[PDB]
Ligand binder design. Structure first.
Ligand code: EUT
Length: 550
Protein backbone atom coordinates (compact mmCIF):
# COMPACT_ATOMS: atom_id res chain seq x y z
CA UNK A 1 0.00 0.00 0.00
CA UNK A 2 2.68 2.52 1.13
CA UNK A 3 5.86 2.53 -1.06
CA UNK A 4 9.43 3.09 0.27
CA UNK A 5 11.40 6.41 -0.06
CA UNK A 6 13.13 5.24 -3.31
CA UNK A 7 9.81 4.17 -4.98
CA UNK A 8 8.12 7.37 -3.59
CA UNK A 9 10.82 9.49 -5.33
CA UNK A 10 10.45 7.37 -8.55
CA UNK A 11 6.65 8.02 -8.58
CA UNK A 12 7.31 11.81 -8.19
CA UNK A 13 9.48 11.76 -11.40
CA UNK A 14 6.52 10.09 -13.25
CA UNK A 15 4.04 12.73 -11.85
CA UNK A 16 6.46 15.58 -12.86
CA UNK A 17 6.47 14.40 -16.56
CA UNK A 18 5.23 17.00 -19.14
CA UNK A 19 1.76 16.41 -20.78
CA UNK A 20 3.34 14.96 -24.00
CA UNK A 21 5.66 12.44 -22.18
CA UNK A 22 4.09 8.96 -22.55
CA UNK A 23 4.44 6.33 -19.79
CA UNK A 24 6.10 2.98 -20.67
CA UNK A 25 4.20 -0.26 -19.81
CA UNK A 26 6.57 -1.03 -16.87
CA UNK A 27 6.37 2.65 -15.73
CA UNK A 28 2.52 2.55 -15.75
CA UNK A 29 2.59 -0.87 -13.95
CA UNK A 30 4.37 0.86 -11.00
CA UNK A 31 1.68 3.64 -10.96
CA UNK A 32 -1.08 0.94 -11.02
CA UNK A 33 0.54 -1.01 -8.10
CA UNK A 34 0.48 2.08 -5.81
CA UNK A 35 -2.83 3.58 -7.10
CA UNK A 36 -4.28 3.76 -3.53
CA UNK A 37 -1.23 5.75 -2.27
CA UNK A 38 -1.35 8.28 -5.18
CA UNK A 39 -5.01 9.24 -4.25
CA UNK A 40 -3.59 11.80 -1.73
CA UNK A 41 -1.98 13.82 -4.62
CA UNK A 42 -4.24 15.53 -7.24
CA UNK A 43 -1.39 15.78 -9.84
CA UNK A 44 -1.07 11.92 -10.00
CA UNK A 45 -4.66 11.43 -11.38
CA UNK A 46 -3.52 12.50 -14.93
CA UNK A 47 -0.72 9.85 -14.86
CA UNK A 48 -2.96 7.06 -13.40
CA UNK A 49 -5.66 7.38 -16.12
CA UNK A 50 -2.89 6.99 -18.80
CA UNK A 51 -2.27 3.39 -17.50
CA UNK A 52 -5.93 2.28 -18.03
CA UNK A 53 -7.08 0.45 -21.21
CA UNK A 54 -10.63 1.79 -21.73
CA UNK A 55 -11.52 -1.08 -24.16
CA UNK A 56 -11.11 -3.47 -21.14
CA UNK A 57 -14.36 -3.18 -19.05
CA UNK A 58 -12.89 -4.20 -15.63
CA UNK A 59 -9.77 -1.95 -16.04
CA UNK A 60 -12.20 0.95 -16.79
CA UNK A 61 -14.40 -0.11 -13.79
CA UNK A 62 -11.38 -0.23 -11.37
CA UNK A 63 -10.23 3.23 -12.63
CA UNK A 64 -13.77 4.64 -11.98
CA UNK A 65 -13.64 3.32 -8.35
CA UNK A 66 -10.24 5.07 -7.83
CA UNK A 67 -11.58 8.21 -9.67
CA UNK A 68 -14.29 8.75 -7.01
CA UNK A 69 -11.87 8.25 -4.07
CA UNK A 70 -9.06 10.46 -5.60
CA UNK A 71 -8.26 14.01 -4.30
CA UNK A 72 -10.46 16.68 -6.06
CA UNK A 73 -8.57 17.66 -9.25
CA UNK A 74 -8.02 21.24 -10.50
CA UNK A 75 -10.02 22.96 -13.33
CA UNK A 76 -6.90 22.81 -15.61
CA UNK A 77 -6.67 18.99 -15.14
CA UNK A 78 -10.46 18.60 -15.83
CA UNK A 79 -9.94 19.91 -19.41
CA UNK A 80 -7.60 16.94 -20.17
CA UNK A 81 -10.42 14.43 -19.40
CA UNK A 82 -12.73 16.15 -21.98
CA UNK A 83 -10.15 15.63 -24.81
CA UNK A 84 -9.97 12.91 -27.55
CA UNK A 85 -7.84 10.71 -25.19
CA UNK A 86 -10.77 10.09 -22.77
CA UNK A 87 -14.03 8.91 -24.45
CA UNK A 88 -15.37 6.97 -21.36
CA UNK A 89 -18.72 8.60 -20.31
CA UNK A 90 -18.21 8.31 -16.48
CA UNK A 91 -14.71 9.98 -16.73
CA UNK A 92 -16.31 12.90 -18.67
CA UNK A 93 -19.04 13.29 -15.95
CA UNK A 94 -16.32 13.77 -13.26
CA UNK A 95 -14.58 16.35 -15.54
CA UNK A 96 -17.94 18.22 -15.88
CA UNK A 97 -18.42 17.94 -12.05
CA UNK A 98 -15.17 19.95 -11.48
CA UNK A 99 -16.20 22.66 -14.03
CA UNK A 100 -19.45 23.06 -11.98
CA UNK A 101 -17.25 24.22 -9.03
CA UNK A 102 -15.48 26.82 -11.27
CA UNK A 103 -16.92 30.34 -11.83
CA UNK A 104 -18.55 31.65 -15.07
CA UNK A 105 -15.51 34.00 -15.50
CA UNK A 106 -13.16 30.94 -15.79
CA UNK A 107 -15.74 28.90 -17.82
CA UNK A 108 -15.84 31.70 -20.47
CA UNK A 109 -12.03 31.39 -21.06
CA UNK A 110 -12.31 27.64 -21.88
CA UNK A 111 -15.78 27.83 -23.62
CA UNK A 112 -14.24 27.74 -27.18
CA UNK A 113 -12.45 24.46 -26.23
CA UNK A 114 -15.55 23.18 -24.31
CA UNK A 115 -17.69 23.41 -27.52
CA UNK A 116 -14.91 21.39 -29.30
CA UNK A 117 -15.07 18.72 -26.52
CA UNK A 118 -18.73 17.91 -27.54
CA UNK A 119 -17.21 15.92 -30.49
CA UNK A 120 -16.04 13.20 -28.03
CA UNK A 121 -19.33 13.17 -26.00
CA UNK A 122 -22.11 10.52 -26.41
CA UNK A 123 -24.08 11.56 -29.56
CA UNK A 124 -27.11 9.37 -28.60
CA UNK A 125 -27.43 11.03 -25.12
CA UNK A 126 -27.35 14.46 -26.89
CA UNK A 127 -30.09 13.44 -29.42
CA UNK A 128 -32.24 11.70 -26.71
CA UNK A 129 -32.30 15.04 -24.81
CA UNK A 130 -34.96 16.52 -27.16
CA UNK A 131 -38.65 16.67 -26.08
CA UNK A 132 -35.16 14.19 -41.27
CA UNK A 133 -32.04 14.88 -43.42
CA UNK A 134 -29.41 17.08 -41.65
CA UNK A 135 -29.20 19.43 -44.72
CA UNK A 136 -32.92 20.38 -44.31
CA UNK A 137 -32.12 21.96 -40.88
CA UNK A 138 -30.44 25.38 -41.30
CA UNK A 139 -28.57 26.27 -38.04
CA UNK A 140 -29.31 30.01 -38.59
CA UNK A 141 -33.07 29.13 -38.68
CA UNK A 142 -33.15 27.12 -35.35
CA UNK A 143 -33.29 30.12 -32.91
CA UNK A 144 -35.29 32.36 -35.37
CA UNK A 145 -38.06 29.70 -35.70
CA UNK A 146 -39.57 28.97 -32.21
CA UNK A 147 -42.45 26.46 -31.86
CA UNK A 148 -21.73 13.31 -11.79
CA UNK A 149 -25.38 13.82 -12.95
CA UNK A 150 -25.02 16.21 -15.97
CA UNK A 151 -23.04 15.60 -19.20
CA UNK A 152 -21.13 18.31 -21.20
CA UNK A 153 -24.17 19.28 -23.39
CA UNK A 154 -26.57 19.48 -20.38
CA UNK A 155 -23.99 21.47 -18.30
CA UNK A 156 -23.09 24.08 -21.00
CA UNK A 157 -26.81 24.83 -21.70
CA UNK A 158 -27.75 24.94 -17.93
CA UNK A 159 -24.97 27.50 -17.17
CA UNK A 160 -25.81 29.51 -20.35
CA UNK A 161 -29.53 29.81 -19.33
CA UNK A 162 -28.29 31.71 -16.20
CA UNK A 163 -25.52 33.85 -17.85
CA UNK A 164 -26.33 36.08 -20.90
CA UNK A 165 -22.61 36.57 -21.87
CA UNK A 166 -21.99 32.77 -21.66
CA UNK A 167 -25.21 32.13 -23.71
CA UNK A 168 -24.05 34.63 -26.42
CA UNK A 169 -20.63 32.92 -26.94
CA UNK A 170 -22.01 29.32 -26.61
CA UNK A 171 -24.56 30.13 -29.38
CA UNK A 172 -22.02 31.53 -31.91
CA UNK A 173 -19.39 28.83 -31.09
CA UNK A 174 -21.96 26.05 -31.83
CA UNK A 175 -23.30 27.91 -34.99
CA UNK A 176 -19.75 27.90 -36.53
CA UNK A 177 -19.42 24.11 -35.87
CA UNK A 178 -22.88 23.58 -37.50
CA UNK A 179 -21.85 25.66 -40.59
CA UNK A 180 -18.53 23.69 -40.80
CA UNK A 181 -18.68 22.15 -44.33
CA UNK A 182 -15.64 19.90 -43.54
CA UNK A 183 -17.44 18.37 -40.48
CA UNK A 184 -20.70 18.19 -42.56
CA UNK A 185 -18.97 16.02 -45.25
CA UNK A 186 -16.24 13.99 -43.41
CA UNK A 187 -18.41 13.04 -40.36
CA UNK A 188 -22.20 13.76 -40.66
CA UNK A 189 -22.85 12.30 -37.14
CA UNK A 190 -20.73 15.12 -35.57
CA UNK A 191 -22.61 17.76 -37.67
CA UNK A 192 -25.99 16.20 -36.60
CA UNK A 193 -24.82 16.36 -32.92
CA UNK A 194 -24.04 20.14 -33.07
CA UNK A 195 -27.52 20.71 -34.65
CA UNK A 196 -29.10 18.74 -31.73
CA UNK A 197 -27.00 20.82 -29.22
CA UNK A 198 -28.47 24.01 -30.83
CA UNK A 199 -31.99 22.43 -30.92
CA UNK A 200 -31.65 21.48 -27.19
CA UNK A 201 -30.32 24.99 -26.27
CA UNK A 202 -33.25 26.69 -28.10
CA UNK A 203 -35.70 24.28 -26.31
CA UNK A 204 -34.26 25.05 -22.81
CA UNK A 205 -34.40 28.85 -23.48
CA UNK A 206 -38.14 28.62 -24.37
CA UNK A 207 -38.80 26.47 -21.22
CA UNK A 208 -37.09 29.08 -18.99
CA UNK A 209 -38.49 32.16 -17.19
CA UNK A 210 -39.19 35.74 -18.54
CA UNK A 211 -35.46 36.76 -18.62
CA UNK A 212 -34.47 33.36 -20.16
CA UNK A 213 -37.16 33.70 -22.93
CA UNK A 214 -35.92 37.29 -23.61
CA UNK A 215 -32.38 35.88 -24.22
CA UNK A 216 -33.45 33.66 -27.19
CA UNK A 217 -35.35 36.58 -28.85
CA UNK A 218 -32.15 38.71 -28.51
CA UNK A 219 -30.09 35.79 -29.98
CA UNK A 220 -32.65 35.55 -32.86
CA UNK A 221 -32.30 39.36 -33.34
CA UNK A 222 -28.46 38.93 -33.44
CA UNK A 223 -28.69 36.12 -36.07
CA UNK A 224 -31.16 38.17 -38.22
CA UNK A 225 -28.81 41.22 -37.91
CA UNK A 226 -25.84 39.00 -38.98
CA UNK A 227 -27.80 37.34 -41.88
CA UNK A 228 -28.79 40.82 -43.19
CA UNK A 229 -25.16 42.08 -42.78
CA UNK A 230 -23.87 39.04 -44.79
CA UNK A 231 -26.44 39.81 -47.57
CA UNK A 232 -25.17 43.44 -47.51
CA UNK A 233 -21.51 42.21 -47.67
CA UNK A 234 -22.33 39.91 -50.65
CA UNK A 235 -24.00 42.80 -52.61
CA UNK A 236 -21.02 45.15 -51.89
CA UNK A 237 -18.38 42.50 -52.86
CA UNK A 238 -20.39 41.65 -56.06
CA UNK A 239 -20.71 45.40 -57.03
CA UNK A 240 -18.78 46.21 -60.24
CA UNK A 241 -16.28 49.09 -59.95
CA UNK A 242 -13.54 50.47 -57.67
CA UNK A 243 -13.41 50.88 -53.81
CA UNK A 244 -15.34 54.23 -54.00
CA UNK A 245 -18.20 52.66 -56.06
CA UNK A 246 -18.33 49.75 -53.53
CA UNK A 247 -18.28 52.16 -50.50
CA UNK A 248 -21.23 54.13 -52.00
CA UNK A 249 -23.22 50.83 -52.24
CA UNK A 250 -22.31 49.96 -48.58
CA UNK A 251 -23.36 53.43 -47.23
CA UNK A 252 -26.64 53.50 -49.26
CA UNK A 253 -27.80 49.96 -48.26
CA UNK A 254 -27.02 50.63 -44.55
CA UNK A 255 -28.97 53.94 -44.67
CA UNK A 256 -32.05 52.18 -46.14
CA UNK A 257 -33.43 50.88 -42.79
CA UNK A 258 -36.78 49.75 -44.33
CA UNK A 259 -34.94 47.27 -46.64
CA UNK A 260 -31.84 46.16 -44.64
CA UNK A 261 -32.67 47.05 -40.94
CA UNK A 262 -29.01 47.73 -39.93
CA UNK A 263 -28.86 51.51 -39.12
CA UNK A 264 -31.87 51.59 -36.73
CA UNK A 265 -32.52 48.53 -34.50
CA UNK A 266 -33.83 47.95 -30.92
CA UNK A 267 -31.15 47.76 -28.14
CA UNK A 268 -29.63 44.33 -28.94
CA UNK A 269 -26.28 42.88 -27.66
CA UNK A 270 -23.31 42.99 -30.07
CA UNK A 271 -22.29 39.35 -30.95
CA UNK A 272 -18.58 40.33 -30.54
CA UNK A 273 -19.08 41.87 -27.03
CA UNK A 274 -22.56 41.06 -25.52
CA UNK A 275 -21.99 43.53 -22.61
CA UNK A 276 -22.12 46.33 -25.26
CA UNK A 277 -25.70 46.93 -26.56
CA UNK A 278 -26.04 48.45 -30.07
CA UNK A 279 -28.50 50.89 -31.77
CA UNK A 280 -27.14 50.04 -35.25
CA UNK A 281 -24.30 50.74 -37.73
CA UNK A 282 -23.53 54.39 -38.72
CA UNK A 283 -24.14 54.43 -42.54
CA UNK A 284 -22.06 57.54 -43.44
CA UNK A 285 -18.83 56.33 -41.67
CA UNK A 286 -18.74 52.75 -43.12
CA UNK A 287 -15.97 51.99 -45.70
CA UNK A 288 -14.08 48.91 -47.04
CA UNK A 289 -10.36 48.22 -46.40
CA UNK A 290 -7.71 48.40 -49.22
CA UNK A 291 -7.40 44.53 -49.09
CA UNK A 292 -8.64 42.28 -51.98
CA UNK A 293 -10.50 40.13 -49.34
CA UNK A 294 -12.81 43.22 -49.01
CA UNK A 295 -13.19 43.62 -45.17
CA UNK A 296 -15.59 46.36 -43.96
CA UNK A 297 -14.93 48.92 -41.19
CA UNK A 298 -18.29 49.43 -39.41
CA UNK A 299 -18.95 51.91 -36.57
CA UNK A 300 -21.63 50.70 -34.11
CA UNK A 301 -23.80 53.19 -32.14
CA UNK A 302 -23.59 52.00 -28.51
CA UNK A 303 -26.15 52.30 -25.63
CA UNK A 304 -23.97 55.10 -24.08
CA UNK A 305 -23.93 57.05 -27.40
CA UNK A 306 -20.37 55.96 -28.22
CA UNK A 307 -18.71 54.38 -31.27
CA UNK A 308 -17.62 50.70 -31.47
CA UNK A 309 -15.45 50.17 -34.62
CA UNK A 310 -15.43 46.61 -36.06
CA UNK A 311 -13.80 44.71 -38.97
CA UNK A 312 -16.52 42.48 -40.49
CA UNK A 313 -14.88 39.99 -42.87
CA UNK A 314 -16.86 37.94 -45.45
CA UNK A 315 -15.42 34.95 -47.32
CA UNK A 316 -12.58 34.25 -44.82
CA UNK A 317 -12.11 31.86 -41.84
CA UNK A 318 -11.61 33.83 -38.59
CA UNK A 319 -11.27 30.54 -36.58
CA UNK A 320 -7.41 30.57 -36.45
CA UNK A 321 -7.36 34.26 -35.30
CA UNK A 322 -10.24 33.54 -32.82
CA UNK A 323 -8.13 30.86 -31.02
CA UNK A 324 -4.88 32.94 -30.91
CA UNK A 325 -6.76 36.04 -29.58
CA UNK A 326 -8.63 33.96 -26.94
CA UNK A 327 -5.24 32.45 -25.85
CA UNK A 328 -3.69 36.01 -25.69
CA UNK A 329 -6.76 37.04 -23.58
CA UNK A 330 -6.14 34.02 -21.27
CA UNK A 331 -2.35 34.75 -21.11
CA UNK A 332 -3.09 38.45 -20.25
CA UNK A 333 -5.56 37.33 -17.51
CA UNK A 334 -2.95 34.83 -16.16
CA UNK A 335 -0.24 37.56 -16.10
CA UNK A 336 -2.66 40.04 -14.40
CA UNK A 337 -3.49 37.27 -11.84
CA UNK A 338 0.28 37.11 -11.02
CA UNK A 339 0.22 40.99 -10.73
CA UNK A 340 1.90 41.82 -14.08
CA UNK A 341 -0.06 43.97 -16.57
CA UNK A 342 2.05 44.07 -19.76
CA UNK A 343 -0.46 46.45 -21.53
CA UNK A 344 -1.40 43.74 -24.11
CA UNK A 345 -4.19 44.27 -26.71
CA UNK A 346 -6.31 41.04 -26.85
CA UNK A 347 -8.98 42.51 -29.22
CA UNK A 348 -12.28 40.56 -29.39
CA UNK A 349 -12.63 38.17 -32.40
CA UNK A 350 -15.89 36.28 -33.04
CA UNK A 351 -16.64 34.06 -36.05
CA UNK A 352 -20.37 34.15 -36.99
CA UNK A 353 -19.75 31.23 -39.44
CA UNK A 354 -16.73 29.49 -41.08
CA UNK A 355 -17.11 32.06 -43.94
CA UNK A 356 -17.80 35.31 -41.97
CA UNK A 357 -16.99 36.98 -38.61
CA UNK A 358 -16.39 40.15 -36.52
CA UNK A 359 -13.13 41.77 -35.21
CA UNK A 360 -12.65 44.53 -32.57
CA UNK A 361 -10.96 47.50 -34.31
CA UNK A 362 -8.37 49.23 -32.07
CA UNK A 363 -7.43 52.84 -33.00
CA UNK A 364 -3.80 52.21 -34.02
CA UNK A 365 -1.25 53.06 -36.76
CA UNK A 366 0.87 50.17 -38.24
CA UNK A 367 4.70 50.42 -37.67
CA UNK A 368 5.12 50.42 -41.54
CA UNK A 369 2.96 53.62 -41.73
CA UNK A 370 4.80 55.02 -38.62
CA UNK A 371 8.16 54.71 -40.50
CA UNK A 372 6.71 56.09 -43.79
CA UNK A 373 5.37 59.25 -42.02
CA UNK A 374 7.48 59.91 -38.85
CA UNK A 375 10.66 57.92 -39.65
CA UNK A 376 10.90 55.99 -36.35
CA UNK A 377 8.78 54.78 -33.35
CA UNK A 378 10.44 57.41 -31.05
CA UNK A 379 9.54 60.30 -33.46
CA UNK A 380 5.86 59.12 -33.48
CA UNK A 381 5.76 59.01 -29.63
CA UNK A 382 7.47 62.45 -29.37
CA UNK A 383 4.79 63.92 -31.72
CA UNK A 384 1.58 62.58 -30.04
CA UNK A 385 2.85 62.18 -26.41
CA UNK A 386 5.78 64.53 -25.46
CA UNK A 387 7.36 65.18 -22.00
CA UNK A 388 10.68 66.96 -21.21
CA UNK A 389 11.24 65.03 -17.92
CA UNK A 390 10.46 61.69 -19.63
CA UNK A 391 12.97 59.47 -21.52
CA UNK A 392 14.09 60.73 -25.01
CA UNK A 393 11.46 63.54 -24.88
CA UNK A 394 8.66 60.91 -24.72
CA UNK A 395 6.04 60.52 -21.90
CA UNK A 396 7.08 58.21 -19.00
CA UNK A 397 3.61 56.52 -19.00
CA UNK A 398 3.73 55.89 -22.82
CA UNK A 399 7.35 54.54 -22.74
CA UNK A 400 6.47 52.16 -19.81
CA UNK A 401 3.41 50.94 -21.83
CA UNK A 402 5.65 50.41 -24.93
CA UNK A 403 8.41 48.40 -23.10
CA UNK A 404 5.80 46.12 -21.41
CA UNK A 405 3.80 45.53 -24.67
CA UNK A 406 7.05 44.75 -26.58
CA UNK A 407 8.23 42.32 -23.84
CA UNK A 408 4.73 40.81 -23.46
CA UNK A 409 4.09 40.09 -27.17
CA UNK A 410 7.73 38.88 -27.66
CA UNK A 411 7.10 35.94 -25.25
CA UNK A 412 3.52 35.19 -26.51
CA UNK A 413 4.46 35.15 -30.27
CA UNK A 414 7.47 32.91 -29.38
CA UNK A 415 5.34 30.32 -27.42
CA UNK A 416 2.51 30.37 -30.04
CA UNK A 417 5.12 30.20 -32.87
CA UNK A 418 3.56 33.13 -34.80
CA UNK A 419 5.06 33.32 -38.31
CA UNK A 420 4.88 35.88 -41.20
CA UNK A 421 5.95 38.87 -39.08
CA UNK A 422 6.40 42.21 -40.90
CA UNK A 423 5.86 45.95 -40.12
CA UNK A 424 2.20 45.81 -41.40
CA UNK A 425 1.24 43.18 -38.71
CA UNK A 426 3.04 45.11 -35.93
CA UNK A 427 0.55 47.82 -34.83
CA UNK A 428 1.28 50.79 -32.52
CA UNK A 429 -1.04 53.14 -30.55
CA UNK A 430 -0.59 56.79 -29.39
CA UNK A 431 -0.85 55.51 -25.74
CA UNK A 432 2.18 53.21 -26.27
CA UNK A 433 0.49 49.78 -26.80
CA UNK A 434 2.29 47.56 -29.37
CA UNK A 435 0.32 44.54 -30.68
CA UNK A 436 0.25 41.87 -33.45
CA UNK A 437 -2.55 41.36 -36.05
CA UNK A 438 -3.42 38.83 -38.87
CA UNK A 439 -2.56 35.39 -37.40
CA UNK A 440 -2.46 33.45 -40.69
CA UNK A 441 0.82 31.68 -39.76
CA UNK A 442 1.17 30.05 -36.28
CA UNK A 443 2.94 27.11 -34.47
CA UNK A 444 6.24 27.31 -36.41
CA UNK A 445 4.56 27.79 -39.84
CA UNK A 446 6.03 30.67 -41.95
CA UNK A 447 6.10 31.42 -45.76
CA UNK A 448 9.91 32.07 -45.61
CA UNK A 449 12.15 28.98 -45.02
CA UNK A 450 14.07 28.70 -41.67
CA UNK A 451 12.29 31.41 -39.54
CA UNK A 452 13.72 32.95 -36.30
CA UNK A 453 12.11 31.67 -33.00
CA UNK A 454 11.90 35.14 -31.37
CA UNK A 455 10.10 37.65 -33.64
CA UNK A 456 12.12 40.75 -32.60
CA UNK A 457 12.75 43.63 -35.05
CA UNK A 458 15.38 46.46 -35.40
CA UNK A 459 12.67 49.21 -35.22
CA UNK A 460 11.32 47.83 -31.87
CA UNK A 461 14.83 48.10 -30.29
CA UNK A 462 15.30 51.66 -31.75
CA UNK A 463 11.95 52.72 -30.19
CA UNK A 464 13.21 51.68 -26.71
CA UNK A 465 16.25 53.99 -27.06
CA UNK A 466 18.87 51.41 -28.06
CA UNK A 467 20.45 48.36 -26.37
CA UNK A 468 22.21 50.42 -23.63
CA UNK A 469 19.06 52.26 -22.36
CA UNK A 470 17.42 51.42 -18.97
CA UNK A 471 14.19 50.73 -20.98
CA UNK A 472 15.94 47.79 -22.79
CA UNK A 473 17.10 46.46 -19.35
CA UNK A 474 13.40 46.63 -18.28
CA UNK A 475 12.43 44.83 -21.57
CA UNK A 476 14.79 41.90 -20.72
CA UNK A 477 13.45 41.90 -17.10
CA UNK A 478 9.74 41.83 -18.18
CA UNK A 479 10.59 39.13 -20.84
CA UNK A 480 11.85 36.42 -18.41
CA UNK A 481 9.18 37.44 -15.80
CA UNK A 482 6.39 36.91 -18.41
CA UNK A 483 8.05 33.60 -19.43
CA UNK A 484 8.19 32.40 -15.75
CA UNK A 485 4.49 33.23 -15.07
CA UNK A 486 3.28 31.55 -18.31
CA UNK A 487 5.38 28.40 -17.54
CA UNK A 488 3.44 28.06 -14.22
CA UNK A 489 0.18 27.81 -16.25
CA UNK A 490 1.72 25.51 -18.96
CA UNK A 491 -0.69 22.64 -18.04
CA UNK A 492 -3.69 24.98 -18.64
CA UNK A 493 -2.41 26.31 -22.04
CA UNK A 494 -1.42 22.80 -23.33
CA UNK A 495 -4.72 21.09 -22.27
CA UNK A 496 -6.73 23.76 -24.17
CA UNK A 497 -4.52 23.16 -27.27
CA UNK A 498 -5.13 19.38 -26.74
CA UNK A 499 -8.92 20.12 -27.00
CA UNK A 500 -8.26 21.89 -30.37
CA UNK A 501 -6.62 18.94 -32.28
CA UNK A 502 -9.91 18.00 -34.09
CA UNK A 503 -10.85 21.69 -34.73
CA UNK A 504 -10.64 22.68 -38.42
CA UNK A 505 -7.77 25.17 -37.83
CA UNK A 506 -5.45 25.21 -40.93
CA UNK A 507 -2.20 25.28 -38.87
CA UNK A 508 -3.45 22.59 -36.39
CA UNK A 509 -4.94 20.22 -39.07
CA UNK A 510 -1.46 20.31 -40.76
CA UNK A 511 0.21 18.37 -37.84
CA UNK A 512 -2.48 17.55 -35.16
CA UNK A 513 -0.33 15.09 -33.12
CA UNK A 514 2.62 17.58 -33.08
CA UNK A 515 0.46 20.66 -32.04
CA UNK A 516 0.81 20.15 -28.21
CA UNK A 517 4.56 19.22 -28.58
CA UNK A 518 5.21 22.46 -30.60
CA UNK A 519 3.83 24.68 -27.75
CA UNK A 520 5.41 22.50 -24.95
CA UNK A 521 8.96 22.74 -26.46
CA UNK A 522 8.76 26.58 -26.32
CA UNK A 523 7.96 26.53 -22.54
CA UNK A 524 11.20 24.48 -21.91
CA UNK A 525 9.83 22.38 -19.00
CA UNK A 526 13.13 20.36 -18.99
CA UNK A 527 14.91 23.46 -17.55
CA UNK A 528 14.39 24.97 -14.05
CA UNK A 529 13.00 28.52 -13.41
CA UNK A 530 16.54 30.02 -12.99
CA UNK A 531 17.72 28.15 -16.16
CA UNK A 532 14.62 29.36 -18.13
CA UNK A 533 15.61 33.00 -17.30
CA UNK A 534 19.12 32.56 -18.84
CA UNK A 535 17.62 30.65 -21.84
CA UNK A 536 15.21 33.60 -22.43
CA UNK A 537 18.21 36.01 -22.10
CA UNK A 538 20.06 33.83 -24.69
CA UNK A 539 17.04 34.08 -27.11
CA UNK A 540 17.07 37.93 -26.86
CA UNK A 541 20.92 38.08 -27.22
CA UNK A 542 20.83 35.83 -30.34
CA UNK A 543 17.88 37.69 -32.01
CA UNK A 544 19.38 41.18 -31.38
CA UNK A 545 22.82 40.05 -32.73
CA UNK A 546 21.16 38.49 -35.84
CA UNK A 547 18.97 41.62 -36.46
CA UNK A 548 21.79 44.21 -36.77
CA UNK A 549 23.87 41.67 -38.80
CA UNK A 550 21.23 41.70 -41.63
O1 EUT B 1 -6.77 40.76 -38.81
C1 EUT B 1 -6.73 41.98 -38.82
C2 EUT B 1 -6.87 42.72 -37.55
C3 EUT B 1 -6.83 44.06 -37.57
N1 EUT B 1 -6.97 44.75 -36.39
C4 EUT B 1 -6.93 46.21 -36.42
C5 EUT B 1 -6.59 46.74 -35.05
O2 EUT B 1 -7.56 46.26 -34.13
C6 EUT B 1 -7.40 44.85 -34.02
C7 EUT B 1 -7.82 44.23 -35.33
N2 EUT B 1 -6.66 44.75 -38.74
C8 EUT B 1 -6.52 44.14 -39.87
N3 EUT B 1 -6.55 42.76 -39.94
C9 EUT B 1 -6.40 42.08 -41.21
C10 EUT B 1 -5.54 42.86 -42.17
C11 EUT B 1 -6.07 44.26 -42.32
C12 EUT B 1 -7.32 44.32 -43.17
F1 EUT B 1 -8.44 43.99 -42.46
F2 EUT B 1 -7.49 45.58 -43.65
F3 EUT B 1 -7.24 43.48 -44.24
N4 EUT B 1 -6.34 44.87 -41.03
C13 EUT B 1 -5.69 46.11 -40.94
C14 EUT B 1 -4.32 46.21 -40.97
C15 EUT B 1 -3.71 47.44 -40.86
F4 EUT B 1 -2.38 47.53 -40.89
C16 EUT B 1 -4.47 48.59 -40.71
C17 EUT B 1 -5.84 48.48 -40.67
F5 EUT B 1 -6.59 49.58 -40.53
C18 EUT B 1 -6.45 47.25 -40.78
Amino acid sequence: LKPNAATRDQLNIIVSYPPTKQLTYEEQDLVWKFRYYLTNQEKALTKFLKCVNWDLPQEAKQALELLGKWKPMDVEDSLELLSSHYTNPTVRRYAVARLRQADDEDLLMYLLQLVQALKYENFDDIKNGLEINSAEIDSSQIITSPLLEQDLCTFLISRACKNSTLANYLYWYVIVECEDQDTQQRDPKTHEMYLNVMRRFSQALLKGDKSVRVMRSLLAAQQTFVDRLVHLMKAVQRESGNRKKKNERLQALLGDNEKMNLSDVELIPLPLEPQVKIRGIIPETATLFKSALMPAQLFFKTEDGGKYPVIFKHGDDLRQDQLILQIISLMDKLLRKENLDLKLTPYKVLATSTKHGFMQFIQSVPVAEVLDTEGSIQNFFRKYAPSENGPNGISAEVMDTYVKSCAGYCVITYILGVGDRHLDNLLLTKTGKLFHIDFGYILGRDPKPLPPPMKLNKEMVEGMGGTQSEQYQEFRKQCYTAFLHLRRYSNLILNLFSLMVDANIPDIALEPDKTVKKVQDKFRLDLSDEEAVHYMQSLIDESVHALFAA
